[PDB]
Subunit: 333 residues, 4 copies
């Protein structure tokens, strides 16, 4: 009996997480769902964006599936970003973000890469100050975190057909912070002689992803850089409607779509639940249910190929209609 | 005569700047070219990447055309990155990077945008420190610098028919630094009632550029963010072989390709000089020779459409063969 | 009636503030006393060391007299230093700390000086971070805060007999922070030709205060530096049982002893209320009741000279006895 | 023989170092002296305050005896403070600074204490930035540097009869940096069960040193704090004419007076050489010549007690005259 923590969050979180649940239910696997709260709406009702109860429930489960949470673009007393809080507190240091071609009109063919983003430090240390009309933020790179994110990315590349790892960085401008990251990952690469390791300055990396994403296997990079490159890559293979992720540490994992709360479409009945469902597939993989994971992915691909499709894929289908198509496709496998 | 400082830098700078010089010569304008040096090779021979003499030559000229300079990915005592030193020393606070559909196979149609990149602070303040195994860099945002770059971007938007500015930022995670930037630009936008000002989180902006770049007019953002978005954008419209830029302060400007020294192709006689040539067109415009600037851009589009083409555009033309085609087309206008 | 906010705080604040109230009551002046709460005991009772109510009460009065408050030597959730919060929030930028010989055995004669301590920034911005086993704190000096503290100290020096100002600093090891302080105070000094302005390195300053404190008139210095030198100075003239201060901003002021909550003697009935009483005298001066202030100070001197004395001055009097003697001396003037 | 490196520095270093040499010569020990230069004049001649040649000489001798060097109160391109450079580069992490009563007019009796100051980090890390009119310095405290200085002070306390260590700190205002210091020294104290370990807030500590310095045995503290407290303590026992020090690392040591170059009396041949001579005595102790140290100390005390005396001690003797008397007293012992 797998205990799964389900956390909806804000906006389209309320729409795509129940969809993912319905698909998980249709695997037949023994699953016990445990509901918990985080995000802006939780801050409004409980006074904190992440109640202690929610941490307890996550830790009491085998894995968690998170939708999304909205963040203000300014200081709000008592408010801190929910998922970012969870990432640092549970030490979910590896953010694993695959980008794969799928059979939809908006997708470049031939793409199969994974972005591995350091998920605890960098600018995301969030240590900012304002003095008169000058604001300063720490960007922090530690050897320790670089070793762990590097090792994580190397394992992933070693486990993949092409065994190629690109280190994306700005060491040329930031040789102490970005340089420590670069050199540390190259150092741990010595324990992975099967992996071919390359480095790429991050702006070039972004131009290469646009022009020839097929060249990449695994990309490892730092926190903010990974945030950016992973939305870019999603754009290459059909958009945020489809892009999954895992926030993975040593003892737990929180699986979530790369996308946010999407307030421009929350309440319209049309959000694409594919990203949340494929995040659930990654979750099944992490739990040791590789077969069920593949079946979920297969089901999604069948529907993506032959319809119905949500508006972000050029269709006119509701979230409900798309989810049901995926459930029936899965039942037939 | 207009005095134009020429600086080749490293790698393909030695190839594309002479090419650009030859195209300027064919405009028929009176130009006195003042050669100066900078970069990695300059540091090896002189002990500094930017001699004082070079600075004096730049200030003695109406404008400067700069190739590109190599930087290492590690601290090298006495070495500072050349273009970055110039940017800060000469206070070239606005980095203007147009991205525009061109008639070549690698190019999306319908793209016409300008990225206005704050060119002075953010992470490029270069105040890094290392303490045992933790490294820390300052990311600095000031009201003053944000006012100036916001005004520059608003002026450019006001001058363009679609009257739209997007502010790309990450203020949801960095509300003091990125938030100050966001708010200050919004404030100064009050003097520009004709401009439609929108804000967008930088990861989402990167996805939007990949999926629907036609929706953008002008984009303003901070230093590292604009570095990344502008190589992204170069990929949309044929690549770094074509992308021009201007580093523009209140009293001077240094025009240069977005691209670097490209050591993988340096010396092979095949680099695309279009980026340098179009940067010279931006320079001609800055100086008040708008007609000549249009004639240069037209010559370039003629050659891009009908060939010959360099290998980055799928042809087999040399840098000089391409340049000769542009000079010939220029003279026929 | 003058409204006077009374805040006891922790430890011996409970003992010396009621004593100072009694001496104020014996001046004959029209005084309405308004009680408010701050400190550690307030944090335990109310969940914050400075309730908003306390801030309002302070602002609704002509002046405030504060005892002292205990601070932990570690992070305690929800707790912040009370007096430091009030200094920053109410912008009480000048901490005026006089050191004057008194007729008691513990005291050097011929001493009459004022330490003017910047009360807002330096190390006291309290912006600390911990990354693995490395901890960093900001030490901030701004031109503006240095201008205000410089002017405050030059005005005070201008109005005293010797018209001499010493700027105590460590510009020698910290040229950007301490140097800015040093240079800025020297620059505002140009508007005060009446004052002889000298500078002195702070360690040397500490040695000179030990060996010839009689040489000093006014000393101006930064937050932490002035904290240290002011305790040193108190020790020269009878100790902390005698040393008064004012936290003075542009629109209000909080008077308080230099001393803290003295937990080693809280509840022993023997704490010297002279410091609190002299602070009340300073308060009277700020309010424009100079003759009342001189009477209070005279009554204090009479009792110090004749006895009875508290144990910190070698005597055996209770706080109560000492207080009654000052009340009696005051009424006989 | 012992190889002893001698560096004069600037100002009165040119007077007190030759004096100390003279007294060393008169001990009758095999000593080769090796001259070397550093400081501000040295910066003016050779372009650096510390030539590599000087570091090399230091590292080639058994110990170094340093004079004092001048430093400005503003940035000077190319200049770094000499002793501070040597402290960091040679990792001379413990600055041992004894304060003992001597038989002279300006001396409190019954003082015998040692200040052990962390000599490597804190505010001396030399990482300042200036952004518009705001300057910021790093104040850094590491667990490692704290363990190290802690253990040095604990060993010294264990070796003394009163077995008491005070930790002077400001962890009430800076709980992360100063707190880390406090807590770490307490941790390492568990290996020294014989030592009584107390903590004291540095301002209170300064007042206690003024009023009852006889209560202190060993005092450990951070870099800037120790600087101030050690000049304070020199005042107690006759002044900077007498106060000696050692900068002790694991593999080398630089002994030097607490005092600076003393530009107010440099050139007049009146500087008190006792501090330098007592620093040479500390150096003899360090080299294993414990008995010669005790003789040098006894010689100094005889001359301080019986005369002649320099002006700082209320006499009229020259540096040479005083020196010759010390040599004559040493020779008769
Ligand atoms: N893990 C989390 O808690 C995350 C939270 N956010 C937050 O979400 C809020 C809004 O962020 P945005 O910049 O507007 O980015 P977003 O990722 O929420 O949406 C960006 C664009 O993509 C479209 N989109 C996203 N998911 C879609 C879907 N499933 N189906 C169809 N269209 C989809 C949206 O309609 C929107 O136009 C912000 O507060 C942001 O911080 C963003 C990402 C992750
Ligand atoms: N303004 C400057 O001084 C700049 C300097 N750099 C420096 O340049 C060096 C190389 O950096 P990279 O990451 O390799 O970026 P890059 O811009 O030099 O090249 C990246 C890729 O684009 C290709 N490319 C660039 N320009 C081309 C052209 N004109 N024609 C055909 N192909 C072209 C190159 O062959 C390479 O594969 C580094 O040391 C970097 O720090 C990078 C950008 C600007
Ligand atoms: N304005 C404020 O809120 C202040 C608060 N504090 C806090 O006070 C607490 C205790 O600090 P300490 O380092 O022990 O310094 P302290 O100033 O409270 O006491 C230092 C020594 O001076 C003696 N002393 C102080 N005032 C005296 C008096 N009025 N009559 C007789 N003896 C007196 C004390 O008995 C003690 O031995 C700390 O948490 C500190 O943060 C300290 C100073 C000011
Ligand atoms: N180890 C080193 O290299 C040190 C260098 N300095 C530098 O030394 C320079 C002087 O700075 P100050 O603040 O004046 O400190 P200082 O230590 O040179 O002198 C302070 C006062 O003590 C007197 N004094 C010091 N040593 C004496 C002696 N041996 N005999 C008689 N009187 C003595 C001086 O005349 C002066 O009035 C500055 O440039 C400072 O940066 C200061 C201390 C140590
Ligand atoms: O809103 C937030 O606090 C986090 C947004 C979050 C991020 O990593 O920056 C989101 O953009 C993501 O990519 O997971
Ligand atoms: O190599 C360097 O020092 C500067 C790189 C430079 C940058 O702005 O980051 C380059 O990527 C550019 O776009 O100008
Ligand atoms: O306990 C605190 O938060 C501050 C104590 C306070 C200080 O200014 O450091 C105290 O020593 C003082 O001198 O007012
Ligand atoms: O002026 C300098 O560069 C060093 C001063 C030096 C210090 O340690 O702060 C001096 O005051 C000392 O006590 O060693
Ligand atoms: Mg993102
Ligand atoms: Mg770039
Ligand atoms: Mg104090
Ligand atoms: Mg000193």
């Amino acid at each position: 009996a797998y205990r799964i923590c389900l956390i909806e969050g804000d906006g389209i979180g309320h729409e795509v997480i129940p969809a993912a649940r319905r698909v998980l239910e249709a695997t037949g696997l023994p699953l016990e769902f445990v509901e918990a709260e985080a995000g802006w709406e939780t801050f409004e009702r409980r006074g904190t964006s992440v109640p202690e109860e929610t941490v307890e429930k996550i830790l009491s489960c085998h894995a968690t599936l998170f939708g999304a949470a909205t963040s203000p673009t300014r200081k709000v007393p008592g408010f801190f970003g929910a998922i970012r809080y969870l990432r640092r507190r549970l030490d979910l240091y590896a953010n694993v973000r695959p980008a794969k071609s799928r059979p939809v009109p908006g997708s470049r063919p031939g793409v199969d890469l994974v972005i591995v983003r350091e998920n605890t430090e960098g600018l995301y240390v969030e240590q900012e100050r304002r003095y008169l009309d000058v604001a300063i933020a720490d960007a922090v790179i530690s050897k320790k975190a670089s070793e762990r994110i590097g090792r994580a990315a190397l394992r992933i590349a070693e486990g993949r057909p092409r065994k190629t790892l690109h280190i994306a960085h700005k060491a040329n401008v930031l040789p102490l912070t970005q340089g420590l990251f670069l050199d540390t990952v190259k150092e741990v690469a010595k324990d992975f002689p099967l992996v071919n390791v390359q480095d790429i300055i991050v702006d070039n990396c972004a131009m290469q992803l646009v022009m020839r994403p097929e060249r990449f296997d695994v990309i490892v990079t730092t926190n903010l850089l990974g945030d950016i490159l992973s939305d870019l890559a999603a754009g290459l293979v059909g958009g945020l409607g489809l892009a999954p992720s895992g926030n993975i540490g040593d003892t737990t994992a929180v699986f979530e779509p790369v996308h946010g709360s999407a307030p421009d479409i929350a309440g319209k009945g049309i959000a694409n639940p594919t990203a949340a469902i494929l995040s659930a597939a990654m979750m099944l993989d992490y739990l040791g249910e590789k077969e069920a994971a593949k079946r979920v992915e297969k089901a999604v691909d069948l529907v993506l190929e032959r319809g119905p499709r949500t508006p972000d894929l050029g269709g006119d289908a509701t979230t409900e209609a798309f989810t049901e198509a995926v459930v029936e496709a899965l039942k037939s496998l």
